[model samples]
Target: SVPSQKTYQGSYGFRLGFLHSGTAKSVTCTYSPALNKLFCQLAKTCPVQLWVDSTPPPGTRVRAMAIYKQSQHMTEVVRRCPHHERCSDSDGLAPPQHLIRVEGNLRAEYLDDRNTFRHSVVVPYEPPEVGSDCTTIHYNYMCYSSCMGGMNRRPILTIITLEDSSGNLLGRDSFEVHVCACPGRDRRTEEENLR
Candidate 1:
């Protein structure tokens, strides 16, 4: 489940936003129903990366929270696996019930590079090894049956909250890490669908 946008604002008066350069790309994954698992395509582990403002006043604190969306709206190109028995079911397979495990440093750091400066956050993506059949996999991390679909990516919202030395909310921001396959083909247009 996801929190309302207001919830992320907290009591903070300021709003935090992710800088484009430091944000990481969508996670790539491959689903093998026969093996009853989904594996990361590029590496055994994927990390969520984000960048924010580094100019906050002294004594400002930053905290990160990762919230995953359980359900997704399906698209037309999403095809079902021929070998999977659940593919023929009317409702299809339900999403996984377990919470995805997000490991690594949850704190944001202000890094200075002479003329350049920004806050960075890195959280390792660790979804469950198994999931509910082929339609959805690993805590619903990969919501599409086939990575070939244009809408294969599912967004995991990473919320960043800033607080003052007194422990009061200051600002909040949300970043998205998409779990998908076929990295270069996200939202592929009809003309580009020949792949």
Candidate 2:
């Protein structure tokens, strides 16, 4: 179920729009499925990450999603795990969900019902020890780029991290990327800055 506290509730496998520094590439954004575009469209999935930092893990699972937004510049809905997890955009002008636990255990997947694609991933959990202190976070290549749309745009990457089942926060990670919907736009030297 879409938590009431969350502003947006997206599904688990659609891609987000962002730009890379120079070349256009697609990045996964995060381990959570709610970050995807299809999750926003269909809104029928619960996104989670690989669980860690506790003897026992968090509870609940993915079912579906529904994403609402203030606009393209911001997501009024949300990209959180619903339970005790945060999202890449959790702090961006939206309220965070109050979860019983905060574990990143659920992974992303594809489940297109109208046609032939309906896939899910088990995503194994592996990371630094729970007690150990760490600063940085991780990201994927495909989800961070906006090249799929055909227009190349520079994208800023923001990752959300949290503790499992307890609502404790892990931290946030950020990076830059470039996505081009129109590969040819770069070819025009005069329009380089416009692009």
Candidate 3:
């Protein structure tokens, strides 16, 4: 079980910020001590504003990519089924095809007064229904394997990379996004049973 905390720091190499639509206030990413990673919640109906707070060397370009990694629980579901079953493998489980599918360069602006740079982008995510379940597979007359509530909320990793004019890698940073239900409300109670 994870402890309840009030404050969380941004990423180590670069800071990640989120802004709700129609609000000027920006929120810092949440750092999960249990997972040793940074996370942000998309709880509003509109798209969330995502930005990287870092001082990139002059003449460098910033690029970001969003990728989804399968969770351990889903991996276990795939492993428990028999090889001969149709839903025994990951391909048969029907997981999300693209959990986080963002690509391309971010709009960069230099805050000369603060001596920092802001690389920004708008991210939109639509989570699945809370009670939805994966396809059911019958392993035997007495046993069956079917994933429940696994698709509703998923973890997405956004990889931010810095490159030179020639496309050489300079540095990299990343954060996780939790796409779930109950927007505009406290996530703690909504996710209590999920853990």
lDDT leader: 1
Model 3, residue pairs in steric clash? none
Q: Give the TM-score of candidate 3.
A: 0.34
Instruction: Give the per-residue lDDT of model 2 (tens digit) for 59-99.
Output: 32222222222235233222223332334433232234311
Question: What's each prediction's TM-score?
Answer: 0.33, 0.26, 0.34
In order, what lDDT does every prediction score?
0.34, 0.26, 0.31
Residue-level error in angstroms, candidate 3, position 29:
9.6
Candidate 1 global CA lDDT score: 0.34
Candidate 2 residue runs with Cα over 4 Å from true position: 1-72, 76-139, 143-154, 179-195
Q: Candidate 3, residues 118-159: lDDT per residue as tens digits?
A: 112222111223562211111111011121332323443445
- Clash count per candidate: 0, 58, 0
Model 3 lDDT, full chain set: 0.31
